[PDB]
Amino acid sequence: AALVIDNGSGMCKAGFAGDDAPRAVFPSIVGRPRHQGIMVGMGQKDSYVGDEAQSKRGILTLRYPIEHGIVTNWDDMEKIWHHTFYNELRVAPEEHPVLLTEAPMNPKSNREKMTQIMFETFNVPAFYVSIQAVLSLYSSGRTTGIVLDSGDGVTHVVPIYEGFSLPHAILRIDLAGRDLTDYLMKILSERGYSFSTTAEREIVRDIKEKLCYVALDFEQEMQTAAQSSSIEKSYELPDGQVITIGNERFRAPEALFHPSVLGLESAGIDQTTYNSIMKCDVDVRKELYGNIVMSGGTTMFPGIAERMQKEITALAPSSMKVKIIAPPERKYSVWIGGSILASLTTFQQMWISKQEYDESGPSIVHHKCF
Amino acid sequence: AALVIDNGSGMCKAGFAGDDAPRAVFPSIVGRPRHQGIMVGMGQKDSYVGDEAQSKRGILTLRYPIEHGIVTNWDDMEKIWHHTFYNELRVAPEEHPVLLTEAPMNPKSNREKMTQIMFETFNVPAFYVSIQAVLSLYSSGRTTGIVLDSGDGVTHVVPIYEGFSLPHAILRIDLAGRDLTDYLMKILSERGYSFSTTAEREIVRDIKEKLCYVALDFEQEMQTAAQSSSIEKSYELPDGQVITIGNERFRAPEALFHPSVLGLESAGIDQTTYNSIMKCDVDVRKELYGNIVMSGGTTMFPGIAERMQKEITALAPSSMKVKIIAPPERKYSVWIGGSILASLTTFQQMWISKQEYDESGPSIVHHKCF
Amino acid sequence: AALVIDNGSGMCKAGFAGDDAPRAVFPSIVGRPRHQGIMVGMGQKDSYVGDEAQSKRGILTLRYPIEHGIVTNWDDMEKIWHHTFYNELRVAPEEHPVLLTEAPMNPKSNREKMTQIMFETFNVPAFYVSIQAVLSLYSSGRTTGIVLDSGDGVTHVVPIYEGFSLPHAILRIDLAGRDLTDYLMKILSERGYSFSTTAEREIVRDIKEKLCYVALDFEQEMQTAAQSSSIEKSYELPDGQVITIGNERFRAPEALFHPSVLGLESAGIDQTTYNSIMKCDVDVRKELYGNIVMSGGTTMFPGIAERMQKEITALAPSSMKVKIIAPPERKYSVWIGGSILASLTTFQQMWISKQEYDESGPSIVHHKCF
Amino acid sequence: AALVIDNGSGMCKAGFAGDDAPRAVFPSIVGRPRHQGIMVGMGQKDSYVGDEAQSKRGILTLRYPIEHGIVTNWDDMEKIWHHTFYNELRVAPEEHPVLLTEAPMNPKSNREKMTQIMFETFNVPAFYVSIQAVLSLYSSGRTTGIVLDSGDGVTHVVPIYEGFSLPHAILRIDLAGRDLTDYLMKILSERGYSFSTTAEREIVRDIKEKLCYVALDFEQEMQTAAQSSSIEKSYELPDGQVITIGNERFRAPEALFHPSVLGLESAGIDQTTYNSIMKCDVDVRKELYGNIVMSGGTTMFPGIAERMQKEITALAPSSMKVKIIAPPERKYSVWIGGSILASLTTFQQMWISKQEYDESGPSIVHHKCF
Amino acid sequence: AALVIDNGSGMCKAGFAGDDAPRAVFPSIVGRPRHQGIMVGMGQKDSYVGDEAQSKRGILTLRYPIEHGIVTNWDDMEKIWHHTFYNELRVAPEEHPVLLTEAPMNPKSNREKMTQIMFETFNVPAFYVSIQAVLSLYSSGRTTGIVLDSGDGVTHVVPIYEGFSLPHAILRIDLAGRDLTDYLMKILSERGYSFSTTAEREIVRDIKEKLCYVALDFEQEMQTAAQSSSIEKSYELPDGQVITIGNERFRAPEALFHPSVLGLESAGIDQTTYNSIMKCDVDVRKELYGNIVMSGGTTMFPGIAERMQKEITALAPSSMKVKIIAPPERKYSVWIGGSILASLTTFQQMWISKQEYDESGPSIVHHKCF
Ligand SMILES: Nc1ncnc2c1ncn2[C@@H]1O[C@H](COP(=O)(O)OP(=O)(O)O)[C@@H](O)[C@H]1O
Ligand SMILES: Nc1ncnc2c1ncn2[C@@H]1O[C@H](COP(=O)(O)OP(=O)(O)O)[C@@H](O)[C@H]1O
Ligand SMILES: Nc1ncnc2c1ncn2[C@@H]1O[C@H](COP(=O)(O)OP(=O)(O)O)[C@@H](O)[C@H]1O
Ligand SMILES: Nc1ncnc2c1ncn2[C@@H]1O[C@H](COP(=O)(O)OP(=O)(O)O)[C@@H](O)[C@H]1O
Ligand SMILES: Nc1ncnc2c1ncn2[C@@H]1O[C@H](COP(=O)(O)OP(=O)(O)O)[C@@H](O)[C@H]1O
Ligand SMILES: [Mg+2]
Ligand SMILES: [Mg+2]
Ligand SMILES: [Mg+2]
Ligand SMILES: [Mg+2]
Ligand SMILES: [Mg+2]
């Protein structure tokens, strides 16, 4: 069989080909201790990975090796892969093909270096890399859709029509879960809660996951928060402090629809989606207003689908039906689709073999991968 | 029995001999995908034909293999025939004679190549090809008429008198449905609607079919459109956009009567018809002002017959009666007449047999076919 | 001196009396622009004449004011005369007698109107009009002949015997250069070359002039064209396209001998000539089988004389000699003869003077002119 | 005198009639600040125009009021005109006629609204609007040509023959400088350089202007870029970052010849030009393969002329000469020609006067302007 | 006139609007006696403020009511304001508008409570509060800059561009003068000097002010201190003890550039400044590397500017000029700028009036103040 690794910008997910769910999902982070090892009797490591780092954020600088889908630190990413199969899946990469995923329009050098590492370091027998949105559409089993994939680091919109690309109408924006988390720390300081540190960054991430929700109508929610306290429920920090969060619960997610709050000129997910559809030919807009496929954990916000419906129906022409496809598996939809793709026997001829790499080195990829 | 295929420049029509209506009518188009097959799991074809292409114009370059009655792309025309009987009618061409149709004064090489293909590729047992206008007159069951056949690609006028040709007074003009569609796109851009693409070309075709009508008096209609909005009704594009079309509804069809708007020097259908009649002998002009037979879908414009009446009565001498024969079956009148002709037992001796082709090859046709 | 103007149906030719060759020869055409004058800074005219029109056929409707020897458009013919002397010869018509020419059996009204215009508009001091064939026989200096004059618009046969008319045996047929050109466009479309327009009409005229030749034996030529490619040489259109012309080179001229290809019942030039001779008295047929005088540019076809010889010797009785007089000056033979006639001092008493016109108006001509 | 304003889709150009060069050339853009005015003591404006906006793109949403030659935002266009004469030229529009320019086949409503504004708002005494290509041909002083005008927003091909329009063979495509700039941002992200924002859009425009060149042979250039680094020179962003650009330098301009890279079906400039010429009559194709007139800043790419020569000579028939007229003044060729036209005394009768507007309102224009 | 009070986290500064220098500058501290009043005849107070407290630190718990820019003890802050105008300036707050200052991103509740107190307690007629960095930039009279304001309690970086905020790129860190003082006590204990108490805290503050300097190169200074004694000069405690301070003189200030010594993850002032600039748009980074404005007494360290230059030039791209604006008035630059702002007549419409407060209470401020 083959390995499937999404290389998630925020949470790496890996598992065997043909498996319906990923077996290893963990933060794609590394931890470099801040402090001296004065308890000499303790056995220690120079660095930690994933959950091991998450054990003890208070002593670590957490660093994400992927920023906005770009590998910024190959040294650490190597560890992430190494840990993923040698320690967590406990799999020999030398014995199984592995399929990776990358955001569209990503830097060509990043892809080359990725494959160079994977062949020369982990000595994979075969390799492939694919666009995440494609895979997430595989998971739906659809022929057509426009994939509003919004991972931790990147939100990218890909229209697809019965398996033909529409490369001229891809949209990509940097606005993603990480920017939302930074914004949340920025506003949540409004109440006094500091959260200066990268550890508190990792806590405010959890506050986002658990308490934030998408406002169906921002103004209405603001009004009712100005009048009603029922919105301003509460969360407990690891120290036991109890914090409360009112309008902030939905103000932050609202940024997805009004990025200008962050200073980003690019419009929200809804507007970008509409614009992308418009950039496609009139013929396909018929079907691409249907089959809007949400994907990624950034789409896991409660009420996101409803807001998308509202917005797009307002933007889209009259007499045009909108259908937001919002499966429950959104967090995994990419990995599942990669599993399906790798399982296809027809696809088995697509893998870049160690032979082809030896024939052509890291620049082979552009001739093979989609 | 024998097959009857009109080989329509815009919509191929085929069916069994003796059938009163064609069973397969479809656009004579092929589709070559513009884009990469990134959804590798989708089963796909290198090209599409007819309705299959029409499913998904947004991803295809639509190409008509017949331009102005000339086969410009034998590679695709072969597919059109192949699809017509092997896939749609689901008929063995090896077992049934097939009767084709061609515009008059057409290039001799096109006819030769046509028969060469049909004998050598599809191995038809017997073959014949006839002038479309003749067949359309058969469908009327008349002995005499002047056939103002106006297909998608060609408009050609043939006077016929009790089954004798009048080859000296045939007229042919390139002005046809396709030119009208191009003109419509040209003017309809006046309002902003772009329709640059071959897909939008295929939409504007439908706008023509559904909304355009022939002005009984162009100036009057222009005036009332300048004063009355009741003319400027509306159509819905596949994306759901709603467009409105005023004087353009009848300005475009008017080109049939004033081709100079397109820059073509040749006069309109009415003038050409009159001129052709005049080129016949005085004896037959008596009857050829009667029995004017409209044919082809280009003649399906509402009010066309009335305008023809008006114009010809104005051009024709006094005391001369004009009678525009305008059956409801105009779109099919050629194919129906071919069906009748093939059904005639007397005609069964006219077919060019596989024997005669083997005796004489592709140049046999000139000695046989009318 | 006097002006001599042949008023050629296809190429007007004019010059001074006593001159051995015409000084102005140009197409008898006018050009009415098809299109708007958007380049406002260009100085322009509402219409063009002759070579000025020929400069820019692509923007003009070329119209011949003379059809089959009948002035169909006096408005334009007036321009042709006006241009001829006021602009090209740069001669005052008010100061010089002018001699015109007309086909025999031509409409009496055309002759009346011609002289009415010439006296009332251009105020010529003196006027005469003569039959073209007569003049062409003058140019030969013969006393007897049968003149097979074949201009652009009309072919007319006049037997003449020592200066006595034989009005009972004149033959006239519409078959002429223009009909040949139309036929050539008709057949040459066989290969694909469209030539729909009046401009392409004027190009196909040149194709006729340069490549066509008369078949000594049509069947033999057809056979050898079916076997030999050496016939099918080639011509270059003004756009630079290169066309080839095989049997068409001689098929078209053959129409002169078998007009039935065009549907005209009247027999060919040879048959008509023979018939006319037969309609003369037995006495003169002795000499009229000799002194057959070719004339007009339609007779400029290579090998025409040989074919005439063959045909007439086959039709004519045995022991009868045939002699086709085929000078090199055929294109001009009418005008030259008119020059000679006008130069004759004896003829100076024949001119219709401005005095006689004032005495009797346009109907004087029938009492004077031959 | 009269004002001449090209109303450039990307750079408005204005100056006095009879001037050989425009005095005001500036981006046709407006700037709406993104951020609060916290430095209350600073005197500020609600919006900025042209160079004032360009001073400080980092705080502005740059918006072009003209998209593909269509005024999309009359509110801002009004400012552009207002600034042009009241602030930059410092001219009273109430006292000088002004001549505008518009792309051919443009929406009729846009032209009406344009003149309505100019008469009712700026109270011009006289007005005219003309097709840009015409003017650019004036600047050449030619009688004939085919104008491959390629502005920022629109590329449109107009054949012209001695001042007669050929409206039947105009071609227009949306592919222009702006699309090229978007494509450049799209590909240049290949290296990592983000350029998400409208400000970075305006920087990448400069990268295009300064570093891009047209490949004489795309494949050869690609090969040598794959082998040679000498192509991949470098540019400095305003922040001082230094970027390098290899094959991208010529890949982007190549889109002009292969728009399919952008997904546009319409062929390149060369193909469109050839097709347009072919759509003209055979007569004029002789001269329109000569006198191909380049125009617009999109044509300023180095080596564009050579590529055009190569392509057209390959497409055009043999024995046909091609002559790409490539003056150095291309950026201004429209405005200069408008200056010439307005200077013509003969043209002084063409202006639409405030009187005629009062007589007939905004719909007068269609009866007057070309 | 209006009062200007900076509400300095470490030294409150107050004076009249339009004054070039603050008239009252004093520690923002209160003193609560530790001990019984056994000398009953002495007249005494329950608490002391500012300099009165500083008279007799040995008997007082010094408490700063502002911690890291947050009012932690409203009871004492009220006294600070009360003393400031009723006792030191000897001004009626009921009669003069007062302008306060606050750090950016500060808790919204603190601002509300501030204005509530100032209106309800001191009954100010008018009120405004502004960001300190803005004011400090006013004092420079610049349109653009990035303000590295480092007060006693907070260091906060604000980029400003021609009076538009860049709220997305503000940085704030807790590292300030107070943390430096704590660190100094921590290290200076290395030599034996205890300084446990809040009084000795207030002495070590003076040691910092008088002896510490910023190392241009920490390693070099460490080396030379390891070799040279000339660094280790000396200070006299109030008791007359004489202490010496070597590498400690510059080790402590170095923390500003390497906060990790204190365990703070956030990078130094230089790194934060660079990062903030980077978070601004490329357009403005051109000018924000210039016009770096130092502010606050924490910036008064000798050689700080040089180190900033060095660091930023090393971090900033090549060919980018850096200009550290380091006026001599740094301690007062905020207050002076507030004076200027209040003096502006245009600003007089910005004050929140007692009327508006009565209309809207403490929550008015968010709608008014920047
Ligand atoms: N409950 C949640 N609600 C909203 N966003 C979430 C939630 N859980 C995770 N995310 C966001 O999205 C990421 C996980 O989703 P995923 O789509 O798999 O992207 P990635 O694989 O790049 O992390 C996060 O790390 C976080 O920013
Ligand atoms: N409702 C309609 N009104 C006018 N023209 C039509 C209509 N439907 C089809 N046509 C035109 O004529 C064609 C169909 O008619 P037909 O006479 O069978 O010719 P062909 O077989 O060459 O298409 C078209 O493809 C179109 O140009
Ligand atoms: N080389 C040629 N070969 C055959 N026919 C020609 C040639 N040149 C001209 N003609 C034909 O005859 C005309 C010129 O000859 P001409 O006898 O003077 O008659 P007209 O004066 O009526 O034109 C033409 O315009 C053309 O139809
Ligand atoms: N050096 C250059 N090379 C290529 N294209 C350019 C250059 N300078 C400007 N352009 C392009 O063309 C425009 C300027 O040329 P112009 O023909 O006057 O059209 P417009 O007036 O509509 O801007 C641009 O704004 C840009 O897209
Ligand atoms: N000479 C000095 N060198 C370095 N820091 C100083 C000096 N004097 C005062 N400071 C520091 O900064 C403060 C005074 O500066 P200021 O910028 O006005 O901030 P604040 O108003 O919050 O005190 C102090 O109380 C102290 O931490
Ligand atoms: Mg993922
Ligand atoms: Mg048909
Ligand atoms: Mg003649
Ligand atoms: Mg321009
Ligand atoms: Mg301060």
Coil/strand/helix, residue B281: coil
Q: Which of these, B66, B146, D33, A263, lies nearest to E164 by C-alpha position?
A: D33
Pairwise CA distance, residues B55 & B45, whole Å: 14
Instruction: Sort E236 into a burial class: Cβ within 10 Å, 0-12 / 13-18 / 19+.
Output: exposed
| Cβ neighbours of residue D194 closer than 8 Å, sequence gap 6 or more | A174, D200
The distance of B281 to chain C (nearest Cα, Å) reads 9
Give chain B's radius of gyration (CA, Å): 21
CATH architecture, domain defined by B138-175+265-329: 2-Layer Sandwich (3.30)
Which residues, including other chains, have CB under 8 Å from residue B357's CB and lie 6 or more apart? B115, B119, B127, B364
Neighbours of A90 (CB within 10 A): 8
Q: Which of C33, C38, C57 shows the shortest C-beta gap to D283?
A: C57
Query: Is C67 touching ligand 3 by the criterion CB < 6 Å?
Result: no
Phi, psi for B233 (deg, rounded to 5): -75, -170
Domain E3-133+334-367: CATH architecture, name and number where available: 2-Layer Sandwich (3.30)
CA C16 to CA C5: how far, in whole Å? 9
Helix (H) or strand (E) holding B286: helix B282-288
By C-alpha distance, the chain B residue nearest C198 is: B265
3-state SS string for B105-131: CCCHHHHHHHHHHHHHCCCCCEEEEEE
Report d(CA A126, CA A100) in Å as an integer.
11
- Does CATH number 3.40.50.970 belong to domain C138-174+267-330? no
In whole angstroms, what is the distance from residue A99 CA to residue B40 CA? 15
> Whole-angstrom Cα distance, residue A340 to residue A138?
7
Instruction: Give one word for B49, left, alpha or beta, with left for phi > 0 and alpha for psi -120 to 50.
Output: beta
Burial state string for D312-351 with b = 16 or more CB within 10 A and e = fewer than 16:
beebbeeebebebbbeebbbbbbbbbbbbbbbeeebeebb
Do D and C count as touching (3 or more CB pairs closer than 8 A)? yes
Asked whether the beta carbons of B99 and B126 are under 8 A apart, the reply is: no
Q: What are phi and psi of E354, to 5 degrees?
A: -50, -35
Are the Cβ atoms of D168 and B262 closer than 8 angstroms? yes
Closest Cα to atom 24, ligand 3: which residue? C152
Question: Using CA atoms, how far apart are residues E29 and E55, in angstroms rounded to an integer?
Answer: 12
In chain A, CATH 3.30.420.40 sits at 3-132+331-367, 138-175+265-329
Distances (CA, A) of D328 to D297, D300, D302: 11, 9, 11
The residue of chain D with its CA nearest to that of E136 is: D39
Which helix (H) or strand (E) covers residue D80, if one does? helix D74-82
Alpha carbons B309 and B319: distance in angstroms, whole number: 14
3-state helix/strand/coil string of C125-138: CEEEEEEHHHHHHH
Which contacts (CB < 8 Å, 24+ apart) does range C244-249 have? C244/C191, C245/C188, C245/C191, C245/C207, C245/C211, C247/C221, C247/C222, C248/C184, C248/C187, C248/C188, C248/C190, C248/C191, C249/C211, C249/C212, C249/C213
Taken in order C83, C87, C89, C93, the sign of the CA dihedral is positive
CA C96, CA B70: separation in Å to the nearest integer? Answer: 58
HEC per residue, chain E = CCEEECCCCCEEEEEECCCCCCCEEEECCEEEECCCCCCCCCCCCCCEECHHHHCCHHHEEEECCEECCEECCHHHHHHHHHHHHHHHHCCCHHHCCEEEEECCCCCHHHHHHHHHHHHHCCCCCEEEEEEHHHHHHHHHCCCEEEEEEECCCCEEEEEEECCEECHHHCEEECCCHHHHHHHHHHHHHHHCCCCCCHHHHHHHHHHHHHHCCCCCCHHHHHHHHHHCCCCCCEEECCCCCEEECCCHHHHHHHCCCCHHHHCCCCCCHHHHHHHHHHHCCHHHHHHHCCCEEEECHHHHCCCHHHHHHHHHHHHCCCCCCCCEECCCCHHHHHHHHHHHHHHCCHHHHCCEEHHHHHHHHHHHHHHCCC
Residues of chain C with CATH 3.30.420.40: 3-132+331-367, 138-174+267-330
First to last CA, chain E: 21
B292 strand-pairing partners: B146, B324
Residues 102-161 of A with CB under 8 A from B: 131, 134, 137-138, 143, 160-161
Contacts of D142 (CB under 8 A, 6+ apart): D291, D293, D325
Q: Does B44 touch chain A (CB under 8 A)?
A: yes
To which H or E segment does residue C146 belong?
Answer: strand C144-150
C10 pocket-lining for ligand 3 (C-beta < 6 Å): yes
User: Which among A179, E3, A64 has a CA at the least distance from the CA of E12?
Assistant: E3
Pocket of ligand 3 contains residue C301 by CB under 6 Å:
yes
Interface test with chain A among B32, B36, B38, by most A beta carbons within 10 Å? B38
Alpha-carbon distance of D148 to D150, in angstroms, equals: 6
Task: Quickly tell me which residue has 């204190």 as its tokens.
Answer: E262
- Which of D196, D198, D201, D251 is the best mutation test for A, with the most CBs of A within 10 A? D196
- Tokens describing residue A232: 């301003």
C-alpha B14/C-alpha B88 separation (Å) is 10
Domain with CATH 3.90.640.10 in chain C: 177-255
In the beta sheet, which residues pair with residue E100? E129
CB D299 within 8 A of CB D255: no
Residue in E331, E332, E333, E336 to alter for ligand 5 test, most ligand atoms within 8 A of Cβ: E331
To the nearest whole angstrom, how far is the Cα of A283 from the nearest Cα of chain B?
A: 5
Q: Is D217 exposed, middle or buried (0-12, 13-18, 19+ CB in 10 A)?
A: exposed
- C43 → chain D, closest CA residue: D163
Which positions ≥6 away from E302 have C-beta within 8 Å? E213, E214
Helix or strand run (H / E) with residue D258: none
Ligand 4 and D28: CB distance under 6 A: no
CA dist., res. C35 & res. C38, Å (int): 9
Q: Indicate the resolution in Å.
A: 4.0
Question: How many CA atoms lie within 13 Å of B31's alpha carbon, on the beta-carbon side?
Answer: 22
Taking the Cβ of residue D314 and every Cβ of chain C, the question of whether any pair is shorter than 8 Å is answered with: no
Per DSSP, what are the bridge partners of residue A236? A242
The minimum CA-CA distance between D213 and chain E, rounded to whole Å, is 25
Going by C-alpha positions, the residue among E142, E132, E123, E158 that lies closest to residue E69 is E132
| C-alpha to C-alpha distance for C261 and D175, rounded to whole angstroms | 53
Taking CB atoms and an 8 Å cutoff, what residues of chain A touch B37?
163-164
Q: Is B282 on the interface with A (CB under 8 A)?
A: no
Instruction: List the residue whose alpha carbon is closest to atom 18 of ligand 3.
Output: C331
Cα C50 to middle of ligand 8, angstroms: 15
Ligand nearest to the CA of C152: 3
CB A104 within 8 A of CB A172: yes
Cβ within 8 Å, pair C36-D138: no
Chains near D with 3+ CB pairs less than 8 A apart are A, B, C, E
Tell me the sheet residues that pair with D353: D126
Largest distance between two CA atoms of chain E:
72
Chains that touch E (3 or more CB pairs under 8 A): A, D
- Centre of ligand 6 to C-alpha E246, Å, is 54
Q: Do E167 and D35 touch (CB under 8 A)?
A: yes
Secondary structure of chain A in HEC code, one letter for each residue: CCEEECCCCCEEEEEECCCCCCCEEEECCEEEECCCCCCCCCCCCCCEECHHHHCCHHHEEEECCEECCEECCHHHHHHHHHHHHHHHHCCCHHHCCEEEEECCCCCHHHHHHHHHHHHHCCCCCEEEEEEHHHHHHHHHCCCEEEEEEECCCCEEEEEEECCEECHHHCEEECCCHHHHHHHHHHHHHHHCCCCCCHHHHHHHHHHHHHHCCCCCCHHHHHHHHHHCCCCCCEEECCCCCEEECCCHHHHHHHCCCCHHHHCCCCCCHHHHHHHHHHHCCHHHHHHHCCCEEEECHHHHCCCHHHHHHHHHHHHCCCCCCCCEECCCCHHHHHHHHHHHHHHCCHHHHCCEEHHHHHHHHHHHHHHCCC
Contact criterion met (CB < 8 Å) for A173 and D190: no
- Residues flanking ion ligand 6, Cβ below 5 Å: A 6, 8, 151, 334
CA atoms of B309 and B313, how far apart (whole Å): 6
Q: Is C209 in the pocket of ligand 3 (CB under 6 A)?
A: yes
Token pair in block for residue E320: 């980018």
d(CA C168, CA A6): 105
Angstrom distance (rounded) from CA C13 to CA C4: 8
Nearest CA to CA, how far is A268 from chain D (Å)? 14
* CB-based contact, E86 to chain D, within 8 Å: no
Q: Which residues pair with D370 in a beta bridge?
A: none
Q: Which residues' Cβ are closer than 6 Å to ligand 1?
A: A 6, 8-11, 151-153, 177, 209, 296-298, 300-301, 331
**In whole angstroms, what is the distance from residue A59 CA to residue A57 CA?**
5
CA distance A191 to A245: 9
Give the CATH number of domain E138-175+267-330.
3.30.420.40
One-letter amino acid identity for A37? G
| A and C interact (at least 3 Cβ pairs within 8 A) | no
Paired residues of B130 in beta bridges: B101
- From D1, D213, D202, select the one nearest D93 (Cα to Cα): D1
> Tokens 């057949």 appear where?
C187
Q: Does domain C3-132+331-367 have CATH number 3.30.420.40?
A: yes
Under 8 Å between Cβ of E297 and E96: no
Residue closest to D282 by CA, chosen among B260, B265, B257, C64: B265
Phi, psi of C15 (to 5 degrees): 180, 180
**Token digits for C251?**
């098929």
Residues with Cβ < 8 Å from E257, sequence gap 6 or more? E218, E268, E269, E270, E271, E307, E311
Helix, strand, coil shares, percent, chain D, to 5: 45, 20, 35
Ligand nearest to the CA of D132: 9
The SS3 of residue D247 is coil
> Hey, what's the torsion of the CAs at E240, E246, E247, E248, to 10 degrees?
-10
Please, where are the H alpha helices in chain C? 51-54, 74-82, 108-120, 132-140, 177-188, 198-211, 218-227, 248-254, 269-279, 282-288, 304-315, 333-343, 354-360
Within 8 A of C198 by CB-CB distance, chain B residues are 265
- C-alpha D261/C-alpha D175 separation (Å) is 11
Going by alpha carbons, the residue nearest to atom 27 of ligand 3 is C177
Nearest-by-CA chain E residue for A57: E265
| Atom 25 of ligand 2, nearest CA residue | B10
Mutate to test the pocket of ligand 2, among B9, B11, B67, B205 (most ligand atoms within 8 A of CB): B11
From E71, E179, E300, E332, the mutation candidate for ligand 5 (largest count of ligand atoms within 8 A of CB) is: E300
- CB contacts under 8 A, A 219-278 vs D, are 260, 263-266
Taking CB atoms and an 8 Å limit, are A164 and B197 in contact across chains?
no
Beta-strand ranges (E) seen in D222-295 are 234-236, 242-244, 292-295
For residues C259-295, one letter each, b for 16 or more C-beta atoms within 10 angstroms of the residue's C-beta and e for the rest, the string is: bebbebebbbbbbbbbebbeebeeebbebbbbbbbbb
Cβ contacts of residue A225 below 8 Å, gap of 6+?
A231, A232, A246, A247
Q: Which residue's CA is the closest to the ligand 1 atom numbered 3?
A: A209
Can you tell me the distance from the alpha carbon of B73 to that of B31, in angstroms, rounded to the nearest whole number?
13
- The shortest CB-CB distance from D41 to any of E161, E284, E344 is to E344
Strand partners, D33: D60
Closest-CA residue to C179 (of C247, C235, C105, C255):
C255
Judged by phi (left if over 0) then psi (alpha if -120 to 50, else beta), residue D88 lies in alpha
The CATH number for C177-255, chosen from 3.40.190.10, 3.90.640.10, 3.30.70.60, 1.20.120.1200, is 3.90.640.10
Please state the separation of Cα E294 from the chain's center in Å.
12
C114 C-alpha to ligand 3 centroid (Å): 23
Between chain B and chain A, are at least 3 CB pairs below 8 A? yes
Tell me which residue in B70, B174, B260 faces C196 most closely, judged by beta carbons: B174
Give the span between the Cα atoms of A362 and D86, in whole angstroms: 60
* Other CB atoms within 10 A of residue B324 CB: 19
Spatial strand order of the sheet with E3-5 comes to E24-27, E11-16, E3-5, E98-102, E126-131, E352-353
